[PDB]
Amino acid sequence: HIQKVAIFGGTHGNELTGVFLVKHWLENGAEIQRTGLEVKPFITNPRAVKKCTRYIDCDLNRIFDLENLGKKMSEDLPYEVRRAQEINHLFGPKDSEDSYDIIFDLHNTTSNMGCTLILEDSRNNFLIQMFHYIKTSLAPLPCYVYLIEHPSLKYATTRSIAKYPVGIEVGPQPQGVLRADILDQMRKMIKHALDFIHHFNEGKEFPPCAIEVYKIIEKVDYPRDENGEIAAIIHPNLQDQDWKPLHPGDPMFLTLDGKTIPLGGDCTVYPVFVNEAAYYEKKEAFAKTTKLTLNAKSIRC
Amino acid sequence: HIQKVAIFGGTHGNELTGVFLVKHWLENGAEIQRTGLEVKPFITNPRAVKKCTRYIDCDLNRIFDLENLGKKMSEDLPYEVRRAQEINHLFGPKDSEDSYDIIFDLHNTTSNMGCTLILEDSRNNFLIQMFHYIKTSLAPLPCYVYLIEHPSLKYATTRSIAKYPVGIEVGPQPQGVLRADILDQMRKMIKHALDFIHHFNEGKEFPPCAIEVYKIIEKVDYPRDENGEIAAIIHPNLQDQDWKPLHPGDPMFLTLDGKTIPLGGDCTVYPVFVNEAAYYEKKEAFAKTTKLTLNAKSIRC
Ligand SMILES: CP(=O)(O)N[C@@H](CC(=O)O)C(=O)O
Ligand SMILES: CP(=O)(O)N[C@@H](CC(=O)O)C(=O)O
Numbered sequence: 001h002i003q004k005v006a007i008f009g010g011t012h013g014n015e016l017t018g019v020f021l022v023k024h025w026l027e028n029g030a031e032i033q034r035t036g037l038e039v040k041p042f043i044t045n046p047r048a049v050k051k052c053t054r055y056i057d058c059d060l061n062r063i064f065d066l067e068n069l070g071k072k073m074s075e076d077l078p079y080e081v082r083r084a085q086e087i088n089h090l091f092g093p094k095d096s097e098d099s100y101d102i103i104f105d106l107h108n109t110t111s112n113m114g115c116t117l118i119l120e121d122s123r124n125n126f127l128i129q130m131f132h133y134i135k136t137s138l139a140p141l142p143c144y145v146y147l148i149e150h151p152s153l154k155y156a157t158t159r160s161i162a163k164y165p166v167g168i169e170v171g172p173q174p175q176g177v178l179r180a181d182i183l184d185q186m187r188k189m190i191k192h193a194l195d196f197i198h199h200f201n202e203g204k205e206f207p208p209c210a211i212e213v214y215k216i217i218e219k220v221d222y223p224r225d226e227n228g229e230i231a232a233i234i235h236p237n238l239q240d241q242d243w244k245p246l247h248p249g250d251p252m253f254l255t256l257d258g259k260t261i262p263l264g265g266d267c268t269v270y271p272v273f274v275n276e277a278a279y280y281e282k283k284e285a286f287a288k289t290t291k292l293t294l295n296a297k298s299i300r301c
Numbered sequence: 302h303i304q305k306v307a308i309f310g311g312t313h314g315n316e317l318t319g320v321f322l323v324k325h326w327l328e329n330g331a332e333i334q335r336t337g338l339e340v341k342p343f344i345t346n347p348r349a350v351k352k353c354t355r356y357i358d359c360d361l362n363r364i365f366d367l368e369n370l371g372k373k374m375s376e377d378l379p380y381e382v383r384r385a386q387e388i389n390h391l392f393g394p395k396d397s398e399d400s401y402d403i404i405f406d407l408h409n410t411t412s413n414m415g416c417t418l419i420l421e422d423s424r425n426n427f428l429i430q431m432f433h434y435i436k437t438s439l440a441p442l443p444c445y446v447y448l449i450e451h452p453s454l455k456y457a458t459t460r461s462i463a464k465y466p467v468g469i470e471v472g473p474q475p476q477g478v479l480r481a482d483i484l485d486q487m488r489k490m491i492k493h494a495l496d497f498i499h500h501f502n503e504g505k506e507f508p509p510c511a512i513e514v515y516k517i518i519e520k521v522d523y524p525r526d527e528n529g530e531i532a533a534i535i536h537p538n539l540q541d542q543d544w545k546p547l548h549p550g551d552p553m554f555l556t557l558d559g560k561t562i563p564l565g566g567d568c569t570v571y572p573v574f575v576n577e578a579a580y581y582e583k584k585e586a587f588a589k590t591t592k593l594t595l596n597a598k599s600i601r602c
């Protein structure tokens with residue numbers, strides 16, 4: 001039974017949809033309340049929101065792990081690290097029973113991804129049902145689910161503090177810009193998420209279901225010079241083509257001279273986060289994903 | 302007659318099309334040479350480029366004026382002021398005759414502008430001819446001319462150092478992102494600008510000509526808060542509709558609720574830089590322009 005729910009906004013300070021929504025909702029929460037359900041709106045990274053920059057010292061969305069959550073509180077710590085524990089203390093602690101039940105983390109991307117749900121555990125029947133509800137409701141407005149196990153490549157996110165972590169991501173939008181079409185998409189996603197919780201609390205029954213998802217396999221960096229400067233850019237045929245299948249023969253990168261670098265390897269992949277501004281720094285031109293089906297068992301209150 | 306020509310990239314560090322081209326051209330400038338014409342590529346704000354950011358202390362493309370260009374060279378001075386003096390000694394001095402003849406300044410905008418040429422002087426025959434040439438060669442790719450000649454709203458640009466300043470501006474592109482299609486478009490524009498110079502230097506006769514330009518009349522801020530915070534966003538009818546006519550009763554802003562805020566005033570305008578990220582801090586949702594025709598007298602040498 002689901003009691004404590006939060007919506008995080010502005011983990012990254014230059015992603016404004018969330019910042020704008022959560023700031024609005026801290027003033028008039030009507031839209032996100034449901035009878036017998038209190039949801040807390042909350043700005044995760046206030047200083048970065050003030051400078052309208054991604055982060056101050058290091059990326060807040062990668063540090064909710066033992067290495068950082070266990071360091072002794074001290075004003076010598078990088079801002080985001082002090083902020084991480086502050087948040088862990090209020091909405092967690094992580095890996096505990098006192099922690100919130102569901103945290104929604106709002107994000108924007110420069111990639112042409114549309115409405116996307118980020119799923120942190122393949123085995124979780126509740127999350128699979130929530131996502132199935134959300135995809136199906138949004139239709140025909142397209143909506144995809146990105147999955148992260150790995151083993152190596154899973155990052156410790158702000159919303160991992162909760163029992164049920166949910167990433168809501170909507171793009172394309174450049175950083176530091178508010179677009180209405182995006183804002184409308186995001187608040188629709190939230191509407192359906194909150195409605196699912198209400199229909200779970202009100203004892204509704206959900207039959208077994210299947211959702212399609214895209215599993216992370218590998219990240220690909222840009223071809224680079226000897227100094228490490230970018231030597232090729234995303235091919236026009238790959239630009240804006242997130243989710244769509246990329247075959248072993250197909251063009252990936254293009255150089256200034258105008259030579260095409262093709263995919264290679266054994267098989268067909270599904271590119272994700274194609275040409276995200278924030279990942280130039282992280283050396284990820286895009287993510288390779290495999291399409292695979294996830295099955296859920298039925299669920300009751 | 303025209304011998305000194307430069308191409309500036311990285312005036313704004315997080316605008317990458319120019320950076321990428323100039324950096325390529327430093328190492329191989331065959332694409333920007335023309336027989337009997339020496340062309341220098343040059344990174345104007347190398348530190349902003351390094352930090353992938355717009356600027357360090359102040360906006361470099363706003364300070365090429367007597368006030369800043371004439372203060373004594375010190376270390377207390379902001380990076381950009383100190384850097385402007387260097388650019389002025391290298392490629393200037395401004396308003397002097399042994400300054401460079403033509404300087405092209407490459408920029409990107411998050412606004413849906415397509416290829417844009419920025420004109421500084423409306424009575425300037427040479428540039429009106431060059432702009433006419435470039436428009437004609439690009440056809441049927443549209444190409445728009447923005448005339449930033451005020452009275453009081455003209456800022457002091459890196460390229461104003463020359464006798465013939467040219468702003469080249471291409472969008473839509475998110476900051477910090479390198480897109481192939483935009484890269485292609487800027488190249489085409491530079492190609493035709495250099496082709497023009499060549500033809501001119503080879504005694505080619507140029508008949509009179511006319512161009513439609515869009516004259517700056519007013520900048521428009523978002524409706525703000527009691528605390529001075531964005532209270533409404535660009536309406537989706539206006540989003541991405543740069544250069545298109547906007548009439549007095551037409552939707553212009555939208556609140557979260559959402560109340561529509563229409564234009565008002567007594568006549569039709571043409572918005573430009575609709576939703577430009579780098580201008581949220583300038584407090585400018587978009588600029589209002591009027592469409593007007595300029596004439597060039599014939600020219601030769
Ligand atoms: C482009 P983003 O910062 O919204 N991507 C997130 C991914 C997520 O929300 O899980 C991140 O890298 O933290
Ligand atoms: C969005 P931009 O950096 O191209 N704006 C320029 C416009 C110009 O080239 O004049 C500026 O403010 O200097």
Ligand SMILES: [Zn+2]
Nearest residue numbers: 012015107108
């Ligand atoms: Zn984010």
Ligand SMILES: [Zn+2]
Nearest residue numbers: 313316408409
């Ligand atoms: Zn610029």
